[PDB]
Design an enzyme around this catalytic site. Structure first.
Site, PDB file in Angstrom:
ATOM      1  N   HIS A  28       0.823  -1.234   0.000  1.00  0.00           N
ATOM      2  CA  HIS A  28       0.000   0.000   0.000  1.00  0.00           C
ATOM      3  C   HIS A  28       0.844   1.266   0.000  1.00  0.00           C
ATOM      4  O   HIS A  28       0.430   2.272  -0.643  1.00  0.00           O
ATOM      5  CB  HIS A  28      -0.933   0.054   1.198  1.00  0.00           C
ATOM      6  CG  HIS A  28      -1.951  -1.008   1.242  1.00  0.00           C
ATOM      7  ND1 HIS A  28      -1.684  -2.241   1.744  1.00  0.00           N
ATOM      8  CD2 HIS A  28      -3.238  -1.024   0.826  1.00  0.00           C
ATOM      9  CE1 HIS A  28      -2.802  -2.983   1.622  1.00  0.00           C
ATOM     10  NE2 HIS A  28      -3.782  -2.270   1.046  1.00  0.00           N
ATOM     11  N   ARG A  36     -16.052  18.405  25.245  1.00  0.00           N
ATOM     12  CA  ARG A  36     -17.478  17.992  25.160  1.00  0.00           C
ATOM     13  C   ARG A  36     -18.260  18.643  26.317  1.00  0.00           C
ATOM     14  O   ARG A  36     -19.477  18.745  26.216  1.00  0.00           O
ATOM     15  CB  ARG A  36     -17.627  16.459  25.170  1.00  0.00           C
ATOM     16  CG  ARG A  36     -17.066  15.678  23.995  1.00  0.00           C
ATOM     17  CD  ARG A  36     -17.932  15.805  22.797  1.00  0.00           C
ATOM     18  NE  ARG A  36     -19.220  15.165  22.937  1.00  0.00           N
ATOM     19  CZ  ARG A  36     -19.472  13.854  22.672  1.00  0.00           C
ATOM     20  NH1 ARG A  36     -18.505  13.043  22.331  1.00  0.00           N
ATOM     21  NH2 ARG A  36     -20.685  13.356  22.827  1.00  0.00           N
ATOM     22  N   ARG A  61     -22.577  10.531  20.440  1.00  0.00           N
ATOM     23  CA  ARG A  61     -23.180  11.709  19.819  1.00  0.00           C
ATOM     24  C   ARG A  61     -24.607  11.391  19.347  1.00  0.00           C
ATOM     25  O   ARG A  61     -24.825  10.378  18.635  1.00  0.00           O
ATOM     26  CB  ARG A  61     -22.310  12.133  18.654  1.00  0.00           C
ATOM     27  CG  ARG A  61     -20.970  12.720  19.050  1.00  0.00           C
ATOM     28  CD  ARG A  61     -20.183  13.088  17.797  1.00  0.00           C
ATOM     29  NE  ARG A  61     -18.790  13.259  18.154  1.00  0.00           N
ATOM     30  CZ  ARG A  61     -18.188  14.425  18.348  1.00  0.00           C
ATOM     31  NH1 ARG A  61     -18.841  15.560  18.153  1.00  0.00           N
ATOM     32  NH2 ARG A  61     -16.915  14.446  18.677  1.00  0.00           N
ATOM     33  N   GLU A 109       3.387  -2.172   7.333  1.00  0.00           N
ATOM     34  CA  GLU A 109       4.253  -2.017   6.140  1.00  0.00           C
ATOM     35  C   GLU A 109       5.543  -1.246   6.507  1.00  0.00           C
ATOM     36  O   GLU A 109       6.640  -1.607   6.024  1.00  0.00           O
ATOM     37  CB  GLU A 109       3.471  -1.460   4.960  1.00  0.00           C
ATOM     38  CG  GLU A 109       2.441  -2.493   4.492  1.00  0.00           C
ATOM     39  CD  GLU A 109       1.653  -2.120   3.233  1.00  0.00           C
ATOM     40  OE1 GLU A 109       1.941  -1.076   2.613  1.00  0.00           O
ATOM     41  OE2 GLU A 109       0.694  -2.897   2.910  1.00  0.00           O
TER      42      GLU A 109
HETATM   43  O1  BJE Z   1      -8.233  -8.562   0.288  1.00  0.00           O
HETATM   44  C1  BJE Z   1      -8.548  -7.411  -0.042  1.00  0.00           C
HETATM   45  C2  BJE Z   1      -8.294  -6.984  -1.349  1.00  0.00           C
HETATM   46  C3  BJE Z   1      -8.711  -5.584  -1.699  1.00  0.00           C
HETATM   47  N1  BJE Z   1      -9.360  -4.839  -0.646  1.00  0.00           N
HETATM   48  C4  BJE Z   1      -9.572  -5.345   0.581  1.00  0.00           C
HETATM   49  N2  BJE Z   1      -9.175  -6.615   0.921  1.00  0.00           N
HETATM   50  O2  BJE Z   1     -10.184  -4.485   1.376  1.00  0.00           O
HETATM   51  C5  BJE Z   1     -10.368  -3.216   0.715  1.00  0.00           C
HETATM   52  C6  BJE Z   1      -9.501  -2.170   1.390  1.00  0.00           C
HETATM   53  O3  BJE Z   1     -10.196  -0.933   1.356  1.00  0.00           O
HETATM   54  C7  BJE Z   1      -8.275  -2.103   0.431  1.00  0.00           C
HETATM   55  C8  BJE Z   1      -7.115  -2.968   0.911  1.00  0.00           C
HETATM   56  O4  BJE Z   1      -6.085  -3.028  -0.057  1.00  0.00           O
HETATM   57  O5  BJE Z   1      -8.779  -2.534  -0.894  1.00  0.00           O
HETATM   58  C9  BJE Z   1      -9.863  -3.453  -0.720  1.00  0.00           C
HETATM   59  O1  BJE Z   2     -13.219  13.231  18.950  1.00  0.00           O
HETATM   60  C1  BJE Z   2     -12.281  13.208  18.147  1.00  0.00           C
HETATM   61  C2  BJE Z   2     -11.615  14.419  17.827  1.00  0.00           C
HETATM   62  C3  BJE Z   2     -10.465  14.355  16.831  1.00  0.00           C
HETATM   63  N1  BJE Z   2     -10.150  13.000  16.411  1.00  0.00           N
HETATM   64  C4  BJE Z   2     -10.835  11.916  16.791  1.00  0.00           C
HETATM   65  N2  BJE Z   2     -11.920  11.965  17.629  1.00  0.00           N
HETATM   66  O2  BJE Z   2     -10.332  10.813  16.239  1.00  0.00           O
HETATM   67  C5  BJE Z   2      -9.240  11.138  15.370  1.00  0.00           C
HETATM   68  C6  BJE Z   2      -9.773  10.789  13.968  1.00  0.00           C
HETATM   69  O3  BJE Z   2      -8.673  10.320  13.195  1.00  0.00           O
HETATM   70  C7  BJE Z   2     -10.306  12.145  13.406  1.00  0.00           C
HETATM   71  C8  BJE Z   2     -11.818  12.317  13.625  1.00  0.00           C
HETATM   72  O4  BJE Z   2     -12.165  13.657  13.206  1.00  0.00           O
HETATM   73  O5  BJE Z   2      -9.466  13.125  14.116  1.00  0.00           O
HETATM   74  C9  BJE Z   2      -9.104  12.661  15.428  1.00  0.00           C
END
Ligand code: BJE
Ligand code: BJE
Ligand code: BJE
Ligand code: BJE
Ligand code: BJE
Ligand code: BJE
Ligand code: CL
Ligand code: CL
Ligand code: MG
Ligand code: NA
Ligand code: NA
Ligand code: NA
Lengths: 251, 251, 251, 252, 251, 252
Positions: free
Chosen positions: E5, E220, E165, E77
């Site tokens: 990826h 919150r 929420r 990775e």
């Molecule tokens: O085995 C697989 C093969 C393709 N996908 C997957 N699993 O899940 C989806 C993920 O978003 C993303 C992970 O590479 O692409 C889709």
């Molecule tokens: O309540 C919250 C506030 C900020 N974050 C969060 N939860 O989770 C992280 C997510 O990646 C993404 C969700 O907006 O940013 C961080």
């Protein structure tokens, strides 16, 4: 042939195959002195161990401490040393209005609100006594003149939140246990304690005979403090009952 | 007055407070004819209902069908009509080599491998019989001349994978149940059936008295095929035993 | 090769690879007589088995009894005898106000409130019909002139607490099921029944094609009582629809 | 105006759209939108790229989700806040059945819930199943493209690696829960692995939203042969043609 | 070699064994530019990858996307390419009244409200940072002049129902999450985010060092709307803090 | 006044103590108290022996817990009722990693919750983690004693026998859940087994109490060498020196 915790050998037990297992180390000598030739064997941590003789047969008395974990060690080590039958005696809080302070309860099954039982059998497995032990305990309790209840016991790894107590430092009870006392009451559960689920599950899944008998020292539905003399009598009667149950188990 | 499934009224039961509950509708008349004045009441789906009289007291006999779901309907509806005591009589496969075809088993607790039990109490709650019913079943079994075992029963929602049978259409058993028969064997479990977890949990959590007694028709460890005569005697003795257990409960 | 419970052989089915599986043994002959050359094969316990011919092809009709456990035995034993497609026809309680008595529901997935489904696949696995069967059932139902709903069915091991009924002996519903009918209603679940989770899970995980169609007999949100005429028309239409869905499945 | 926390669009920006196509990869959004009329870029923030377009005169959204249930659940919720009611997921998948070839298409009839986010909408007992009209439309559009189409169960995993029982990893270990799992799913007839359908289908089926999933098969875990570049490129093009034709079937 | 990826090789990382892992791809370049010789390596999906030099040592900066699933791919990775230490920098919602907008939180453990953590360790395993990372993050955050909180973070697979929420399309929260924010508040949990349970569990169980530091962007429990300056200052400080924490981890 | 149900002490008996040292063994209470100033015996009931002492002019309680979460939970609750806010556990442990030697010390950074009592305070998802100040103080005190110190995860079991995957037992069996578990924890980097930290740390982290655990390694499950008497005696003495120095750091 030695064990990790109890401090005793197989020879020290003089052929005993039956143990009485109270919680409190201080009660061990008291139980042993109801029998013949009581001998102090060892004390380490919560484990005080005596031998005695009942109708000519060697009996062990061994404290467990509070809770399934410490209980599980004592049972395992006693079994390594030849013990096959375990009689638990203790105190309990009743949750049914009809159950009075001074009554006796013989557990027919435990609600597994513990963790140690899961180290012997998955949750589906019943925390049930050996039928012969339960039958001996009921007979001994009834022959004493006590009022005896047979039924289900809730067995908790905590004294406080798992018994739905709110008079605590935080005053909080985790979601799992909120409303739990009313649920157990509605389901007909008689009482709370902290060791039977572990003891009964471990023994019923391991080829050991076990049961539990307890004196009621408090009723969670009654706000009044019980009478000092009633509590004294209940404690004394409980240990006379477990020794008579042991007599009934001897072969 | 009336119930959804069983097709009987409270008045039809003539005051009965005790029911015998076999699984097979065809066994209802066979049990009822061991008592006085048996009368057919209704048949709907798997539910065949008779009334009879035992020592001058009314007794219901009602089939349950196979499994906890159909059992749970019968018990509930009978309880709506005033029944408080439920005696299950059935067949079972033993899984211990010391238990022979023709022996009887009185369940002291069930391994909850069902679903319906969870509709009455969480998994922690023990699937245990009423102690007086279990005591009466033991006594009636012994007095019939049968070899009687008291112990734990594995109670499965399936006949096939939940009893770890591989001689099936797919030949597969889900991960949960792979190795399960040996696990229960090593834990001392005596036998498999399909209703006791639901029956015992529902009754123990609802103010109803219940127990289970069964004749052993097969042993999963023995290659020998049991002959027709030993099977026929075992089914006859089972129903004689459950009616004598009922007599002890009404006494 | 005569199966444990159903009392029939592979030869008895005259090459059938499709079964219609109602719950009530008394409905088996009614469904068989909608086809050609209906033949009674066997009756034992809740299992009545007939064979008939549809467009010249042999079709089985076999009752299941109430609940997943008795259903699972019928499905397994039919599969042993070569049956690969299973069409369930039944009755159901709707829980959505827009669903009327007399409508038909084709299940697109089941809420697994059972135990037997877990004996075939872990809870994560979807209780899903075969797409061809669901498509055939929708087509048959719509062609009949019925109002047809496709959607999720809640499939309970109990009729009473698992459908959140309080008009019971105890009036108690365990914590898991308290508030559950509103929860399912708010998630868009159409109806309650007692077999589809087991049937659909076991078939989807075993290489068997299955689906479920039902006529609505009651709506838990409507105060009005349906009349006898509407219910009779509904029962009659349900079995005409399942036979037409069988015709659409034949190859 | 009506705004949302993450996607960066307003209800007015969607011009009345009630249907969204939801691929995972932001770079695929414009590719889907250009198969329709009057595609317009609306917004890009984090993994969420959003276009509008028109299909047979009706507005359609195209919005990427990112990998996994958590990011997908945000996009679906916010699109639903802005009036979207039907969600068509198009994506890639690994097949686990020997009979399913690279280049085939799978329409999911139900998902094995190997995720976490589905549990935030419904307890595990609830089925991860598509809307029946969406699945039906997906099947028809797939067949009409000339593809070989499979209907069946998909295993939907919160991980690419241990939850798909991959051992060629940094640790080489798979937690107990997932040891032996691919063989288990294979024996239960499961067709394929992906990472979003359990969350999407559970979320929507328990919230009054119509959802389905269609995917092109890019690898088969049971075949040693490496698929060629040509086959893969053809597969990605046909998948997005199929999901647009499924959307057309849903709108009329 | 390469990975599935991220679109980079081991050689591209020029020996880096430490990664800074924000969620937002757009923040990667900002963090890399706080160090020396920033170089863009790749961008695919939510994964933007840069390399830079900190005190002469190579550092990777790689976005994760939102959620444990996409995080788990990036971490795996990078580990395949030789990265052993992972510093997460992010934003968070405080749920305690004493925590202000602009404060910084260093997670000492996460509530596992995710799914991906379970793909590395069973639920009993703690979602715990490496002690050296947490120590370095605390020191960097305190040296910046911020007010710093050490404590437990609730790590959810959703932004909406799993953070309780209700201002949503359905306005419904599943039973599991009803009342959950008050439960976490009473248990002293400081904040919500969406990745720490997965990151900390996978690393603690896989031989990798990880920790999380976040700037509070909202509370919150407070009504005051943070002004634009304070939010911009908080975002800026958070990334300066994580780079100084990286400096402290370098050997 | 008020005297708690089990410990047999009153708030006044504690002379303002807000910090407790909580060993398992009642016989170790006096041994810890004598390393401080003006040690006084307060009470002994069941597994609960209670002393007071003074450290740098401040009152400190020493209270044994018994074996296991259940008896620990009672002692912590009742001390908290009487004003204690900081709990330092000192004990012994079995290492499961080959690099950890008998005589080393372990400071737990998190516990695998193989107990039951932790669930009576927080659901399983909640982390069994120490207060960061306590863990920091314990590390510093342990290093300052000359010990070899390890920071890391501890497996905390309701049993000594099956939950620590011991087979040298009466039945010789371990339930399915725990079969293979020691290798599983070893490969996840878990350092050691004990029987109280999951309950203690979960209880305190969810209740507004500061807690930590430090232990001396008395056995290594991967070693055949029998530890000698002198090394074990030195380990027990060093452990209690370390916990008192950690307390001094907490009161500073
Ligand atoms: O085995 C697989 C093969 C393709 N996908 C997957 N699993 O899940 C989806 C993920 O978003 C993303 C992970 O590479 O692409 C889709
Ligand atoms: O309540 C919250 C506030 C900020 N974050 C969060 N939860 O989770 C992280 C997510 O990646 C993404 C969700 O907006 O940013 C961080
Ligand atoms: O509610 C009660 C009442 C008495 N006991 C109890 N629970 O559990 C037993 C513990 O060992 C100990 C807890 O005080 O004594 C027993
Ligand atoms: O192993 C067995 C042997 C007999 N039974 C059984 N399991 O369960 C009971 C079912 O009702 C039915 C299944 O045949 O009969 C009883
Ligand atoms: O709510 C309902 C309404 C009808 N059924 C049902 N639940 O389950 C099916 C059972 O077999 C049986 C229970 O009466 O009939 C079907
Ligand atoms: O593996 C071990 C080694 C030592 N301990 C232990 N597990 O748990 C602690 C128990 O309280 C008690 C069990 O012996 O001592 C501690
Ligand atoms: Cl009883
Ligand atoms: Cl660490
Ligand atoms: Mg009424
Ligand atoms: Na049945
Ligand atoms: Na993502
Ligand atoms: Na103890």
């Amino acid at each position: 042939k030695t064990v990790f915790h109890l401090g005793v050998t197989e020879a020290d037990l003089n052929g005993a195959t039956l143990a009485i297992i109270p919680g409190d180390p201080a009660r061990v000598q008291k139980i042993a002195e109801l029998m013949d030739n009581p001998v102090f064997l060892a004390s380490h941590r919560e484990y005080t161990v005596y031998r005695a003789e009942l109708d000519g047969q060697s009996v062990v008395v061994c404290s467990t401490g509070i809770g399934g974990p410490s209980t599980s060690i004592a049972v395992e080590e006693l079994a390594q040393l030849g013990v096959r039958t375990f009689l638990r005696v203790g105190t309990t809080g009743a949750i049914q209005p009809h159950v009075n302070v001074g009554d006796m309860i013989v557990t027919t099954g435990s609600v597994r609100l513990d963790g140690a039982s899961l180290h012997f059998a998955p949750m589906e497995f019943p925390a049930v006594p050996d039928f012969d032990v339960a039958t001996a305990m009921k007979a001994a309790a009834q022959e004493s003149g006590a009022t005896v209840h047979m039924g289900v016991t809730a067995s908790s790894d905590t004294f406080y939140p798992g018994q739905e107590r709110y008079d605590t430092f935080t005053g909080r009870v985790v979601r799992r246990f909120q409303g739990s006392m009313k649920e157990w009451q509605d389901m007909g559960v008689l009482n709370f304690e902290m060791e039977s689920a572990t003891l009964l599950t471990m023994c019923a899944s391991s080829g050991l005979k076990a049961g539990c008998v307890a004196g009621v020292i408090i009723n969670r539905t009654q706000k009044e403090i019980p009478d000092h003399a009633t509590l004294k009598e209940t404690e004394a009667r409980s240990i006379k009952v477990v020794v008579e149950a042991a007599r009934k188990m001897l072969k």
